[PDB]
């Protein structure tokens, strides 16, 4: 239909502008903070978030050309493996780093003494490695289950394959379904429920405390906080909701194909999540005036 054609074309340009803006912003943030700015805990967190976002966007054009030509992969097995490992690791690391930044801000606000006396750079990297190793652990099935699969028609898709794992098709299908459901539950809980609860709670207490202390001298802090939380919610809740609905209805989809709107709606939700990955430096790094003055002095 005419509406479906527009609804399919739009994610392409959304991912293209996401790629361009994310690469530009992440490169600028890395160049400013990582080289022309002092190494602080918040600077380390911003550097890690910018590095993850830059690695993701630099990988985005592969996904863009995949969505352009109907999810087909013209590239090789090793290249799709690497591209999806980088994509998954960057997404998990970006979400975990957003959660960790929210937690650090909450700790600094509610308990300033602990932040003053127990926030060192060495400890900063030591605790930031944790989200990264968590991303690797969650991606381990994506490392070792994923492999490119060619259909008998001669077209190639890099998806999940279970011929080696399962001797007979029945047990292979059963383990495929159970692993996909487990991955969906892990994504919804750790990837989405854990940070969204953390981000709302951490930013909620920060706004609650400053209101009681009479710290509200301008609308800028409240505006920034509400913008960040609202953007994160409106870009991540739909995508994770679609993923959860697909996982809980995966058996019906692969056995009867009852529902088809979820498959169509995956692409806009992925585009919105990628746009969030693009705008994270905008609402996390450029908000500070020190970064802006350093950037304008850099040019």
């Amino acid at each position: 239909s005419a509406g479906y054609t527009v609804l399919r074309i739009l994610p392409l340009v959304v991912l293209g502008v996401t790629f361009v803006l994310g690469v530009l912003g992440n490169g600028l943030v890395i160049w400013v903070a990582g080289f022309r700015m002092t190494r602080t805990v918040t600077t380390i967190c911003y550097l890690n978030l910018a590095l993850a976002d830059f690695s993701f966007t630099a990988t985005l054009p592969f996904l863009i050309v995949s969505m352009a030509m109907g999810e087909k992969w013209p590239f090789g097995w090793f290249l799709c493996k690497l591209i999806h490992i980088v994509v998954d690791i960057n997404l998990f690391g970006s979400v975990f780093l957003i959660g960790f930044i929210a937690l650090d801000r909450c700790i600094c606000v509610l308990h300033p003494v602990w932040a003053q006396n127990h926030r060192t750079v060495s400890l900063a990297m030591k605790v930031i490695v944790g989200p990264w190793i968590l991303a690797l652990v969650l991606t381990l099935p994506v490392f070792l289950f994923l492999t490119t699969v060619t259909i008998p028609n001669g077209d190639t898709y890099c998806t999940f394959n279970f011929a080696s794992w399962g001797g007979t098709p029945e047990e292979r299908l059963k383990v495929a379904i159970t692993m996909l459901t487990a991955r969906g539950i892990i994504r919804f809980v750790i990837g989405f429920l854990l940070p969204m609860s953390i981000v709302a709670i951490c930013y909620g207490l920060i706004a609650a405390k400053i209101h009681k202390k009479g710290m509200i001298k301008s609308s800028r802090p409240l505006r920034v906080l509400t913008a960040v939380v609202a953007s994160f919610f409106i870009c991540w809740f739909p995508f994770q909701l679609v993923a959860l609905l697909g996982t809980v209805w995966l058996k019906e989809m692969l056995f009867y194909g009852k529902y088809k709107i979820i498959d169509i709606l995956v692409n806009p939700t992925s585009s919105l999540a990628f746009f969030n990955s693009c705008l994270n430096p905008m609402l996390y790094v450029f908000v500070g005036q020190d970064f802006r003055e350093r950037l304008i002095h850099s040019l």
């Binding site: 999810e71 999806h84 994509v87 998954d88 997404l91 998990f92 979400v95 994923l146 699969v149 259909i151 898709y157 998806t159 999940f160 495929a176 996909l180 994504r187 990837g191 679609v242 993923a243 697909g246 995966l250 989809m253 692969l254 498959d263 995956v266 992925s270």
Partner: peptide, 7 residues
Amino acid sequence: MYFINIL
């Protein structure tokens, strides 16, 4: 995180 289609 990134949704992967199933054949």
